[PDB]
Structure formats: C-alpha cells, structure tokens
Amino acid sequence: SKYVDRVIAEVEKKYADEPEFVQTVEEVLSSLGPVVDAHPEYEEVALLERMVIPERVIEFRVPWEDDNGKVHVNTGYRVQFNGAIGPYLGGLRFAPSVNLSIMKFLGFEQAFKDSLTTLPMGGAKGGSDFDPNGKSDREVMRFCQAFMTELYRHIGPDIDVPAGDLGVGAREIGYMYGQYRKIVGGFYNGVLRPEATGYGSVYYVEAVMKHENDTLVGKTVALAGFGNVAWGAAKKLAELGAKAVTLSGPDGYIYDPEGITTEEKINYMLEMRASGRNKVQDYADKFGVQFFPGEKPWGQKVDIIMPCATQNDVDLEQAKKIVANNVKYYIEVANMPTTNEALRFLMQQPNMVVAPSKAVNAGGVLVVGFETAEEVDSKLHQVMTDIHDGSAAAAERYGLGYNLVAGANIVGFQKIADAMMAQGIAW
Amino acid sequence: SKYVDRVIAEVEKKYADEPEFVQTVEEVLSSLGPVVDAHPEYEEVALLERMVIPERVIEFRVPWEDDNGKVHVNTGYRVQFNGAIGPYLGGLRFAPSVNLSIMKFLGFEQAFKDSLTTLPMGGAKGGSDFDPNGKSDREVMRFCQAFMTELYRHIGPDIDVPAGDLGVGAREIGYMYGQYRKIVGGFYNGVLRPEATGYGSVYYVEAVMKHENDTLVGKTVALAGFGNVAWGAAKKLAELGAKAVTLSGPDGYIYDPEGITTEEKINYMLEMRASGRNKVQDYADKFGVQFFPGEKPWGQKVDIIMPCATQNDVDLEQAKKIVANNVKYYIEVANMPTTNEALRFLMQQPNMVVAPSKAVNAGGVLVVGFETAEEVDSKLHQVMTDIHDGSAAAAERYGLGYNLVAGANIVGFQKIADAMMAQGIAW
Amino acid sequence: SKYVDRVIAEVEKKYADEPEFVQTVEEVLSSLGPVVDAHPEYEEVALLERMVIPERVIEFRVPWEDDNGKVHVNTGYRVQFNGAIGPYLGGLRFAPSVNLSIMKFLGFEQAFKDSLTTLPMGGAKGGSDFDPNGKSDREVMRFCQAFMTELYRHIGPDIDVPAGDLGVGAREIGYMYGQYRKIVGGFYNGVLRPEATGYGSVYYVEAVMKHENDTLVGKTVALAGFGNVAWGAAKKLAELGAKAVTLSGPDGYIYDPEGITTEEKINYMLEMRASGRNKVQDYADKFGVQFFPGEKPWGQKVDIIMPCATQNDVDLEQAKKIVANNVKYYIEVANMPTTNEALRFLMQQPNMVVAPSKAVNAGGVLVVGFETAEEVDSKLHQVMTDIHDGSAAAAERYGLGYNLVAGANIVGFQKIADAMMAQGIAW
Amino acid sequence: SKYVDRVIAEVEKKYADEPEFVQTVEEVLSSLGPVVDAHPEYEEVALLERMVIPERVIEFRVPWEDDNGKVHVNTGYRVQFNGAIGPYLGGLRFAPSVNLSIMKFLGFEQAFKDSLTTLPMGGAKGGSDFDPNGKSDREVMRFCQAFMTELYRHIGPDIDVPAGDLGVGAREIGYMYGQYRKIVGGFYNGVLRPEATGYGSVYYVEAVMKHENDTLVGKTVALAGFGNVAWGAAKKLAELGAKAVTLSGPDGYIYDPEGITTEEKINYMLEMRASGRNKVQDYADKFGVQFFPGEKPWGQKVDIIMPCATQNDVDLEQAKKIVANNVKYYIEVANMPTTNEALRFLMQQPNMVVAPSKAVNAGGVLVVGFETAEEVDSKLHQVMTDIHDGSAAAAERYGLGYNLVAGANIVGFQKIADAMMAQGIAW
C-alpha cells in the first residue's frame, strides 16, 4: 500500500535513532497492506500516523542509594502506547540496555499481542537502565521504592497495569507493590510465572503441528538461551514428545543429542540462570557435552528452531544455514529474535512455517489477564490455539496462504483500528 | 524465642496502659516461638516490632445533637492495623467502654482472623464510646451521620471496609452508608447476619468432634450471654443434636436442663436482647427456671464450654471449677473471653481441647468477604473446617500436638509475615 | 464556674493516663470561669466539651533502616486539635519521650498561642518518639522520608502546616520537604530561626517592664537550659541591658555573675548544644565558673526567672525558694516549665508578675505566619506588645487585676469560642 | 574538575543523539570546576549526575483536524527538569524543529535562568513539532485544545507553569487557557510581552557599560534576526543612544548605517515578522539599503554583537571575523547563538566582554514571575543589574576575573545545589 509504504518511510526518517522501534514498525505495517487497501477510511483519519506514536511517554529520574551509602541515579520509563481496547498492560524491564527505542518497540509489540488475547487490554511497557545484577536485595528494594515513588501516579487499576519481565521478578514486583500500597494507601491486588509463556509457546506449536497434519512426537528442537523462556519450552517439549538439543549464551552454545529431557538436565537451567554467571558452558561442564565457544546454534540440524534468548539473534547469514538444513519450523518465542531481512527470507522459504513472537509468546499476558492450576493450562492451551487459527484464517481471507506472521499482525491490528475508529479523533 | 520474649516485654512496658492490647499480643506472639526460630530473617527486618504497631490510627471528635437539641460529643476511632494481604476490613463497635486499647486489640485480632479466612483482607477496627442504648433512632442517625462525616475520607472500597459489630446493627450501617453516599456521591455497595458467626462456630465444633472421633449428638453446652452470638449457637446446637443449658448476664446466669432447644425458648433470646433490660433472669421468669444471682455459669457440669458474652469472662478461678468438672471441650466464641492465665492453665489441661475465638468466630467476616442461602451454609461450613484442619496441621508440623490455639496463630501469622516480607520495608 | 469545674473533673478522669494534657487543660480552663459565666450559650452547645477533644488524631508506624541496614520502627503523630480560626499550624517534635499525651498538650497549647498572634491559624502538633541524637544525617533523611511518606496525605497548604521544634531543625524540615515535593509533586514553599522566640520573649518582658514603670537595664536573669531558647534570650537580654547568670542542664546548673553577656560566652551556648554532650558544666569548665551538680537554679538571687529548658522544671518547692528571694518577675518561656501547683502559688504571690509561656514564646509562630530582617524585629516586637497589652486589658475587664496568665487564656479562648460558635455544630 | 570532566564525558556518550542538550551541558558544567572542587560533598550524593537528568519527561500524541477535515498528528512535550527551588516554570515552543534534545536543552537552560532571577521558580520547557505557520486561527485553536487536553494533568498553579515562546503567542496561550478552564473548571489566572526580554537585555548591557566605565551612547550594534527579540533591543538601544545597523534572516542580512533608530524603521520589524515571508531583504526593499544574500552579519565592523536569531548562529569562523574587527562586546540574547568552540575562543579573547544568553535574556521570565508599566521597567532594570553584578562577583570570588559566562553559571547553579542538598536524595 502506498499509505502504508509512506508512513513506514516517514517513521524510518523520523526515528532513525530508535532502530528497534523502526524495525518493529516496518515488520508490522509491512504486513498490513491488503487491509489498509480495503479501508480507505483509515487514511482519512490518519490512523497509521496516530498508531505509531505512543499516546503518552514518561521518563523519569530515579536516584537511589546503595548498601555503601553511595548514590546512583538511573532513568525510569513508562510507555503507555495504546489504550484503544482497554487499560494499558505491560511489564517492566530492568536492564542496562534499556532506552526509549526499546521500551517503544516492546510497547508497540505489546499492544498487538494484547489485542490478540481477546482480552480487552491495551499495550504499555516500562523499565529502567538499572541492572539488578550484582545488586543486594536491599538495594533492589530501595531502587524499586524510588522507582515507584514516581510511577504510582501514572498507573492504577483501570489505567495502567504493570507486570513482570526481564529483570523484574516476583521480588521486584513485591517491592514495588509495597511502596504503592504505602503511598496511595489503596493497595489493589498485584501490580502484575513464565511456564505460561513457555507452555503457551509449545501449545501454539501443537496447533501448528495439527494444521500441518504433523506431530511433535520425536522432534529435535534448537533453543537459544537457557533462561525462563527456554526452560519452560524444553520442559513442555520434553513432556510432549520432542526434546531440546541446544541452548546458547553470550559465550556460544551447546549441543545435546540425548535431549534436554530429564528432570535433572532441565533443573540445571534454573541453576545456571540463578548462578548469574551467564555462561552456557557451565552446562557443558555439568553434563559433559560439546559447547561451541562464541557460536550461534543455527548451523545445527533440527526439526524446529525456537529462539528464546535475545533480539536479532537471527540475521540473514544465520537464516542461510537454516534453510540450508531444510528445517520446516522456525518459531519465534523471544521478541524479534530475527532481523527483518532474515525473516522475510524465511517467510520467503516455501516449505517452512514461520510463527511470530507476538502470537507465540502471548502465553504470559493471557494468564495475567486471568487475574486452579488446570482451569489454566486449559484456557492457555485453548486460547493459544484460537490465536493460531485466527491468524491463519485472517492471512487466508486476505489471500496470503499460511502466513502466521501477517495473520497475527492483521488480527491484532484489526481489533485496534476498529476501536480507534469508534472512539474518534481524540487519541 | 528470645526475639519473641523481648518484643512481648517491650510491648508490656510501652503500652502498660492498654491492657487488652497487651494481653492479645502476649497470647498471639507467645505461640509464635517455633516459627520465628525457623525465620531468623524476620528479626533482621524487625518484623515483630512492625507488626505490633498499627499502620495507621485515627481518633476523631464526633459532636452531635440529641432529640432535645442538647449537644453531645463522643470520640470516633478507626484503627487500620495491617493491610499486608488486602484492604483493611473490620467492624465498628459503639459502646461506652470503647477506647484505643480496645480498638487496638480487636484490630490486631482482626488481622489474624482475616488472615485465616484465606480471603485477602487486612485487619482494622473502629467504633466510638457512643452508647446507642437509650437513644432514639433519629439520634442514632444523627450520630452516625456525624461519625461518617469524618470517616468517609479514610475509607473506601479498596482501602478500608467497615462492617457491623457490637452496637452497630444493620440500622447503623444503613445510616452511615446514606451519609457516605451523600458525601462522596459514589455510593458503592454496603460499607459492610450473625448466625453466620454462631453457625460457623458450631461448624468448627463439628470438625473438632470429628477429629476427636466424637459426636455433638447429646451434648450439654454452657453458653455465656444471651446475645446474637449465643443465640446463633444455641440454634445450631439445638438443630445439630446438642442443647444449651446456660445463658449468663450481668446479673448472673441461669440453668436449663431441658435445654434451650425449642423454637420458643430461643426466640426469647431475641426478646431479651431487644428488651434492652440486660437481665438474664427475665428468662428465668419466662420459662420458670433457676437463675443464679451474680454468678458465672462455669461451675455447671457440661460437655462443652462456649463463652459468647464478654472478655476475660473466664479467669483462673473459673478455669479451676471447669477442669474440676472434667469438661473436654472449651470453645471460645466471643473475643478473649478468658484471661491469658486461665487459658494457659487449660491449654495445660491434658484431656481438653481448646479452640480460639479468632478461628472459631471467623464465621461473620467470611460471609462478608462473600460479597443464595446455602451456597452459603455450604462454604461457611466448609471453610470453617479447613480453618480447623489448617490450624491442626500447623501446630503439628511445629510439634505442638493438637493445639488449636497456637495453630490458629501460626497459620494467620504465616500468611502475614510472607506478605510483609515480600512487600519490603515500607510499612 | 460549675460548667468549667465539671469538664475539668471529667477530663481528669477520662485522660488520667495523659497527665501533661490534663495539666494543661486545668490551667487553661481554670482561668476561664468569668467568661463562661457571661456566656451561658456556650454550655448549650457543649463548647468546652468539644474543645478538649482534638478534631482529628493521627498515629502511624514509621519503619526505617539505619546505616547498618538494621531496621527500626517508631511512631509518628499528628494532632490536628483546632482549626476554628484557620488551617492547623504546628511543629513536629522528634524526641524519645514523645507520646499522645505530650503531642495533645502541645497541640492544645498551640491553638491558644496561635489564637493570640491575631493570625488566623489553628493549632496542631506532630512528632515521633524517634531520637535524632546519635543518628547519621543519612539516617535522619531516611527517617524523615519514611515519616513524610505517610504524613503528606494529612497535610497541605490550606489544611495543616508543620513547622520546626525540638528535634526538628532546618535539616529535618528540608528532608521532609523534599520527600513531599517528590510525592505530591506540588512542592509549595516551606512545610514550615529561634531568636524570634528568644527575642519575642524579651520583647514581651519590655512591655511588662514598661507596664511596671520599670527597666530591664541592670537586671539579673536566671535561665534554665542552654538551648536555642535560652541563647536567644541571653543574647537579647545582654543587648538590652540585663545579663544572664544561670544556665541549667540535666547535670545541674551554673552561676555566672559577670553575666553571660559576651560575644564569646554566648557562642559557647551554641557549642555545647552542638556538642550533644548535654552537660552544662562544659561551660563551667570553659569559663572557669561554679557549677552545681544535680541542682536547679531557682535558689539563686535574681531579678528575673526565665525558664527555658523543660516542663514542670518548677514545682512547689522550687517556687518556695523563689518567692523567698523576692523575685518580682517570673517569666515562662519554655512550655509548662512550672507545676500547676507551683504557678498558682506564684500567681498567689502579690508582688510578683507572672507571664505564661503561650504568650511569651509566641515569637516563633508569629514569624512563621509571616511567610527583611527588621520589617521583622519590628512586627515581632510590636505584636509581642499587643499580646501583652491584650492579655492585660482582658484580665482587667474581668476584674482579675494584672494577671498575665488568665489574660492570655481569655484572649486566645475568646477568639476560638466565637469562631466555633459561628461555625455551628459540625466540629 | 575530574568529577566535572567525567560527567560531561558520560553525558556526551549517553546522549550523543541529543547534541543541543550535550552542548548546553558541557558549557554549563565546564564552568563549574572551582565550585565542585570546594564541595566534595556534591559527588558523595551524585549531584551532577542527578542534575543532568530531568526530574520528569512527558511526550504525547496530539492528533488534530484541519479546516478541511483532514487529521494531523504531532508530538507534545513537557520537560519538568528541575523543581528544587520552586514550581516548574517555562514556555512552550511550537516549531517543526522541536524534539526532546531541544526541549531538554531549553529546559536545562531554563532552570539556571530561573535560578538567577532570585525568584523561586524551577525550570521546564514544553512544545510541539507543530508549525503554527500557514495555519488558520481555528486550526491553532483546535491544535491548542488537543494539546491541552493532555497537558492539563501535568501542570497546575503550584506544580508547573507554562509561559510563551517561539510559536506560542498570546493567542495560543489564550486558546490553551480556555481549554484548561473548561476541563479542570478551576481556571486560575494566565497559564503564563517580549520587550521585557529585549529591554532587560539592554538593561544588562548598561550594567556592563558601567562596569567598563563605558557608554552605550553612540555605539554600533549588530543584531541577528528581526523578530521580537531584536526589535525590543533595537527599540531600547535606539532610545538609549546606540543604534542597530544589522538584521539577518535565512536569506542573509542587511546593513543600515543611519541606524534602525526611527519610529518607522523599527515598526517595519513588526511588519516583516507578521508578514510570514521570513525574508530580511523585504526590509532592504523597504528602506532602500544593502542586503547580503546568504550571509551572516558577523563580518561587519561594530561596537557590539547582539545575536537575537537562532542557535549556533556564531561558530568559530564567524568568531574569527569578529575578534578580527576588535569588537569589545559580544552579547548573547538568543539561546546558544554561538558554538561552544566559538565562545571559548571569544572567552579566550582578552579585550572583549562576553555575556551569556541565560543571564542576558532573563528579562521575560522575571516579569512573568511578577504576576504598572514602570513599577516594571524599574524592577526589570534593577534585577537585570543585580544579575550582572552577582555573576561578576561570583566569577571573581572564584578567581576568574570578569567572566560573565562562568559567573552566571556559578550563581544559578549555586542556588540549585543548595536546594537539592537540603532536600536530600529523593529527586
């Protein structure tokens, strides 16, 4: 679409300095042509142009004191991107790499993901360039308290609901909540455990298998990372028939053919993550396997690719070693783990099925929105499916075949456009 | 525990002038040793020391006019003791004996009781030294309105929820609610009927019977008082097999061996309470029985003791006439109806089972938190049980045998400590 | 007055456990007979009965962490006693001796003092049993922050204005203000330097001298304590003709006949107070004078008594050594530095003039309400006078002669009664 | 200072993408060494590190409809940088070049300028990349209304006060105020006329003249631009003895030796600015003078340089044509009209006097804070002077000679550090 292509171009220019954000926009909008074309009324109200600008952005100074009485100051963020369908919802990420571009891309992704759950929740994202690593508990508490001393005013039950994410575990949330309860004095219930993510991902794969008249039973899966997201996958994979043979880190990745399918193998994933060493080989040391120093696991022969580590983890080169291994299933679980070039390439590859992280990892937020153990697994499992089927049906309707990527975008977007169109020119 | 023993000592000193409150603290904490010992991290964050101080206390002047245009001024209270697990919840008591020590002890008890229901509700208590007795309805209205003209600002749906209690019946609540609706203009639904209390108490006794391989069928029960709490007990007891033979007042108590088990006998309990005469013998006059002028019913031979009147209703002497009648079941239903000395003594007595009011009378708040007739009786019945079983399991785990007193304390406390520990140093 | 005498009696009973408060009430009300007698309409609306109950009381838990990561928990208070004439105004006191009785007595005094300034400000008082002594600056900051994290909600520009007092210096105020600015985000200007107090006191003495056709020139003055209040007095006294010869501490007091009238002698008062040693003799060591170990300076021969240390510093015995030295001028500067028995005695002594702390030390709040250097000294000086003259005129009108004590009470009270009478039965 | 040099370096890195902001920081901090060195306690509390991060930043989507029903969407900003001394205060700039870096640099400058006025006002800045040029009045109204529909919540009387600036004239302010009054329903008085700026600038020059034992009488002044800022200067200059000979635009600049000193010459400045043509030569056409196409007026021989147009209007090359004309007076009036290299160079030039825009143009905000005609000119004139003298005295104290640049920085900074130090670690 010319409207679509323009806006993209405009964003590229305007936010050249926020690459992650630009990347995300291209990808999503690029998939939107067909729809925009059938909705000429969108351009009339500059819909795309409004969508790409967060409704509201908050950056704030977060000064705090360490255990030695030394003062540190970090930056806090809260990006309330789109609330067309409901109160903003999104996690907080505490990592030294966090900035506006990153919060913006996540926030943007979050509104689409939130749109797909069928739950009426908008998208937001927050965080800080603060690094919980190396910090005392007391120090996290103090930081969290400082962080919430400002944030509290921008959020609230039917306004903005924060949740957990990278750097923000139950502990951080507990510390922030206490500060919130102390200030506002209201204290609702939980200002917002990843096996849901991991599980939902696998539950999605099933729907894929089935659509493909296929089976998970006896499949080799390559994971990236060894964090909560891989672990929850490996677990479910192992329990469902398949088995993981790869985990990667910043020091390379390891190959395990027996599969990471044993109560003990997996529990090590917990040990390594809680060991703050951030080194995959510790595993190579543990279970006496082969570890490949400073390498990416995408040259391994596998039935399925399931990247659960970091962004742009898969560029073009890596995608060439993949299609060159005739892997039929590339499944994003971590946010943008593939360069937009890489992906297109794959989307381009005819025998393979590609799934988008925004759909695939919508497991966590689902549950969250859900506030027993199996009234759960049940719904997560089920909704994960409807999400798969919905995306599939949509791509088709628009004559794209089995494009799970576009489909996801079209479905989530469709829910938003309608809302914004009904609500008029205000936001 | 030395930590435990210290704090107790500190409280004793500090609040020497608030005896009821001191009493309650000793009792609860005294039961907490074993746990504290396994949680050395508690002392590190002065947990006990924070717990014994209400988060926030409010006293206020309540000036009002009587039917003769004469002005009276009373004191209002709202003790928001602990909100670790959820919005404060607690009733209001209107009695001329009310003061801070009393609101404090109730508020403190209330957070433990509230903790045991499994409901996420904190503990609070409010009231006034105002005496509804002798007052016109109009006069209660006016007082209630004056009372709420201040309170409204400290409470609210997800902040603090008041309920009914001694002196505060549906009428008072209705009058306060109207004032609230008129001021805030919000008007939620019910700023907060004791047969639940009475019923739950009996439902607890059952769980006890069962644990004891025993039966309620054909048991003699001694009640104290003839208020809503005794009545609801007698009713259920009578309906369940047992029968009441005692009711007490400020003028003594009466003995009825036929049992207070007839539609008519019981309904008199309603008549006497609504007659404002506050004299048990009116009953002795009614059903031609023996009334004992200026005596406490604890010298009677009975299967069960169920004190439903006032606090420290059972000291040491009384406990000596009891163990000396080999009563196996002493069941507190009214708040602290036993001196801490008395109780210990009993707890000390090997054949008897002792139940704590905080667990036993958790019937009312349960229901409240519940906002048909039997979806109710059902849950109340059930939860009452889980409460019994939980307390039992806990005492055991800690090697105390069947100590329903400690068990209650340990369970309620355990839910609170965790919360406070998760929320950090703020409150 | 029978109304007056009753209420007093009622208060005595009711608040037996808050002695300081009882004391203050007796004193003030005891002076009010004549007025009450001419205002029978007061009793009709239970005026006295409302007055003795603070409009609103707030106690709160203040948990904080020390430099060693150890957690401490103290109690915060804010007594908003009377706001008939304007927003509450009052300081905060941080001392380990602080409790409700004390905040209550100060709060009560504060509304009378505030009434006398002609400024439209009500009376309040706050504080904590927290002891800044021995604490690091960081530790005060942290405590102050915790303290304000709760207080902020009860105060505000045209609601309640806190100021400084014992334990609360510019530093504490600065720390609290920053926390306030950070939370509410409003940040007005100064949530509230004692030479004003000290100065005003001396300025009052002048009006007294003049009324007495007397002179300050060449007078011996006995001070108690060596804090900001004595210092500011000594300074002005020294500059005005007189000279201080006594300072007292917890270890006794010292006699200096040359007078504490030298740039250097006085500056030591600053040194001793900033030395946290709390020992008057350090002065005895410094300027080689006589110090009397464990004694009260009231046996010294002096023209004027000016107690600037602590409460009930002067009981009956001490008053007997005083009248027995024929001192014509007893001037309270510190709050209730005399037992009610002592004072009456003195009030009883025919040649002497007695001034009440509430009038005498109204110097500080005046200035405060004032938000150059001499537009100041000017007004303080002047108003101090009008206060003296007003009290004098009032006592007379009521046929009490030159009773500066009663007069103060009558004037301050008169301003309040009128207001409360105009505003009706609400507070 | 090593602390100073570090932070600068850190900022350079971190905000490489916000050049204007980096520039401003270097300049200001670079002047701060001496002070920081005498205040080692600053580093202890990471003062510089907190200062460079705005307390709070707000970006927002501003969708609006044009006269043709076409929808446009712009970005709104409000940077509440520092409120140490008082409520934020700052204008709004509506220009298509506006972004975060720019709002940030202005906001940062604004807190120093605001600090120098002696008024207790913090610094903020807001705006939008919206371009009032070419827009209908109705269209500005609609945009302003949309803009305020979000902003209203972040501002308020004693919170944040917006004022006028580039793109925001009385009309915009009026339109925003009406929207504010309509929403909040409060409607204070003026959510915030440049001859004050212009005048104050000249009033500052006088203080400079005097310090230099010099006279404005018969001086040639080179202005840049022909906007409100030049006009107000020319006017006062013309009235005070001097005369303008240059005005510049985007198309070059013109030379007028008769001087722009006639009621009519000047009034044309109004005509050209209101003609939206943005072409200086229109003037060259009008008064038949020489206009230099695509040139900067800094090669002209003049007594004084007074840049009133745009930022970095004077780089190094331009500064070389200036010192090479031995101009003794370089006076910044527009914000950063000189590259940091240029300036240093000049600061480096021994015979010349350099004045900083932050001091020089503090005329407007002064007045603003002032809410007749000459109670005004009076104070503006006077304060402008004290500002000059203060900066001078400061530079000296620190042994810098007559460095009006550093001096300004030191004075404004000094007021802020103290405040932040008193308020503790919160912001």
Please judge whether D159 and C188 are an interchain contact, meaning their C-beta atoms are less than 8 angstroms apart: no
A182 CB neighbours in chain B (<8 A) are: 426-427
Establish how many alpha carbons lie within 13 A of residue D216's alpha carbon, considering only the half-sphere containing its beta carbon. Answer: 22
Closest by CA to D254, choosing from D229, D280, D278, is D280
Residue D134 to residue D67: CA distance in whole angstroms: 12
Residue B161 to residue B171: CA distance in whole angstroms: 17
B72 CB neighbours in chain C (<8 A) are: 46
Query: Which stretches of A261-403 are DSSP H helices?
Result: 263-273, 281-286, 316-323, 340-348, 357-360, 363-369, 374-397
Residue B321 to residue B253: CA distance in whole angstroms: 16
CATH of C1-51+403-425, one of 1.25.40.10, 3.40.50.300, 2.30.22.10, 1.10.285.10: 1.10.285.10
Structure method? X-ray
Of the partner residues A67, A69, A185, the one whose CB lies closest to the CB of residue C138: A69
Give yes or no for a contact between C166 and C361, defined as CB atoms under 8 angstroms apart: no
Pick the catalytic residue from A125, A135, A219, A235.
Answer: A125
Residue partners of C48: CB distance under 8 A and separation at least 6: C3, C4, C7, C29, C36, C42
Residue C197 to residue C228: CA distance in whole angstroms: 9
Chains B and D: 3 or more CB pairs within 8 Å of each other: no
Of the partner residues C157, C175, C186, the one whose CB lies closest to the CB of residue D424: C175
Residue C261 to residue D243: CA distance in whole angstroms: 63
Enumerate helices (H) and strands (E) in chain D, giving the number of each: 18, 12
Of the partner residues A58, A59, A63, the one whose CB lies closest to the CB of residue D50: A63
For this entry, resolution in Å reads 2.5
Residue C69: left if φ>0, alpha if ψ -120 to 50, beta else—which one? left
Please judge whether D73 and A49 are an interchain contact, meaning their C-beta atoms are less than 8 angstroms apart: yes
Angle at C42 between CA C37 and CA C47, to 5 degrees: 125
Using DSSP's 3-state secondary structure scheme, residue D168 falls into strand
Give yes or no for a contact between B147 and B127, defined as CB atoms under 8 angstroms apart: no
Where, residue-wise, is CATH 1.10.285.10 in chain C?
1-51+403-425
Backbone angles phi, psi at C64, to 5 degrees: -150, 160
Using DSSP's 3-state secondary structure scheme, residue B331 falls into strand
How close does chain B come to C44, measured CA to CA in Å?
Answer: 7
Burial code (b: 16+ CB inside 10 Å, e: under 16) for C146-185 equals bbbbbbbbbbeeeebbbbbbbbbbebbbbbbbbbbbbbbb
Give yes or no for a contact between D53 and D28, defined as CB atoms under 8 angstroms apart: no
Superfamily of domain A52-187: Leucine Dehydrogenase, chain A, domain 1 (3.40.50.10860)
Establish how many alpha carbons lie within 13 A of residue D364's alpha carbon, considering only the half-sphere containing its beta carbon. Answer: 25
Give yes or no for a contact between B102 and B140, defined as CB atoms under 8 angstroms apart: no
Q: How far is CA D180 from CA B322, D56, D154, D175, in A?
A: 74, 21, 12, 9
Q: Does D427 touch chain A (CB under 8 A)?
A: yes
Instruction: Write out the DSSP string of D38-95.
Output: H-HHHHHTTHHHHHTS-SEEEEEEEEEE-TTS-EEEEEEEEEEEE-SSSSEEEEEEE-
Of the partner residues D60, D71, D425, the one whose CB lies closest to the CB of residue A55: D60
SS3 sequence of chain C: CHHHHHHHHHHHHHCCCCHHHHHHHHHHHHCCHHHHHHCHHHHHCCHHHHHCCCCEEEEEEEEEECCCCCEEEEEEEEEEEECCCCCEEEEEEECCCCCHHHHHHHHHHHHHHHHHCCCCCCEEEEEECCCCCCCCHHHHHHHHHHHHHHHHHHCECCCEEEECECCECHHHHHHHHHHHHHHHCCCCCCCCCCCHHHHHHHHHHHHHHHHCCCCCCCCEEEEECCCHHHHHHHHHHHHHCCEEEEEEECCEEEECCCCCCCHHHHHHHHHHHCCCCCCCHHHHHHCCCEEEECCCHHHCCCCEEEECCCCCCECHHHHHHHHCCCCCEEECCCCCCECHHHHHHHHHCCCCEEECHHHHCCHHHHHHHCCCCHHHHHHHHHHHHHHHHHHHHHHHHCCCCCCHHHHHHHHHHHHHHHHHHHHCCCC
* B71-82 and B123-128 strand pairing: antiparallel
Give yes or no for a contact between A163 and A365, defined as CB atoms under 8 angstroms apart: yes
Q: How far is CA C89 from the centre of its chain?
A: 13
Give strand ranges (E) for A190-328: 220-224, 243-249, 252-255, 290-293, 304-307
B65 CB neighbours in chain C (<8 A) are: 425
Question: Where does A195-361 sit in CATH, by number?
Answer: 3.40.50.720
Nearest chain A residue to C180 by CA distance is A149
Q: Does A6 touch chain C (CB under 8 A)?
A: no
Mutation pick from A182, A184, A187 vs chain C, by most beta carbons of C within 10 Å, is: A182
Axis-axis angle for helices D19-30, D2-14 (nearest 10): 180
Please judge whether B50 and C60 are an interchain contact, meaning their C-beta atoms are less than 8 angstroms apart: no
Q: How far is CA B358 from CA B204, B209, B333, in A?
A: 12, 19, 8
Q: Does C15 touch chain D (CB under 8 A)?
A: no
Closest by CA to B131, choosing from B170, B180, B98, B165, is B98
Query: Which amino acid would we find at residue C109?
Result: E
Using DSSP's 3-state secondary structure scheme, residue B61 falls into strand
* H/E element, D200: helix D196-211
How close does chain D come to C6, measured CA to CA in Å?
Answer: 48
Give yes or no for a contact between A120 and A86, defined as CB atoms under 8 angstroms apart: yes
Residue B125 falls in the annotated catalytic set: yes
Give yes or no for a contact between B412 and B396, defined as CB atoms under 8 angstroms apart: no
Give yes or no for a contact between D82 and D123, defined as CB atoms under 8 angstroms apart: yes
* D353-355 and B88-94 strand pairing: unpaired
Give yes or no for a contact between A274 and A219, defined as CB atoms under 8 angstroms apart: no
Q: Is A375 exposed, middle or buried (0-12, 13-18, 19+ CB in 10 A)?
A: exposed
The count of CB pairs under 8 A between chains A and B is 42
Q: Does D72 touch chain A (CB under 8 A)?
A: yes
Residues C271, C273, C275, C276: what is their CA dihedral angle, to the nearest 10 degrees? 180
Where, residue-wise, is CATH 3.40.50.720 in chain D?
195-361
Where, residue-wise, is CATH 3.40.50.10860 in chain D?
52-187
D120 CB neighbours in chain C (<8 A) are: 189
Query: Which amino acid would we find at residue B352?
Result: M
B83 CB neighbours in chain A (<8 A) are: 181, 187
Q: Does B41 touch chain C (CB under 8 A)?
A: no
Residue C244 to residue C231: CA distance in whole angstroms: 10
Q: Does A179 touch chain B (CB under 8 A)?
A: yes
Q: Does B352 touch chain A (CB under 8 A)?
A: no
Residue partners of B83: CB distance under 8 A and separation at least 6: A181, A187, B55, B122, B124, B427
Residue B410 to residue B222: CA distance in whole angstroms: 28
How close does chain A come to B299, measured CA to CA in Å?
Answer: 49
* A123-128 and A160-163 strand pairing: unpaired
Axis-axis angle for helices C100-116, C19-30 (nearest 10): 30
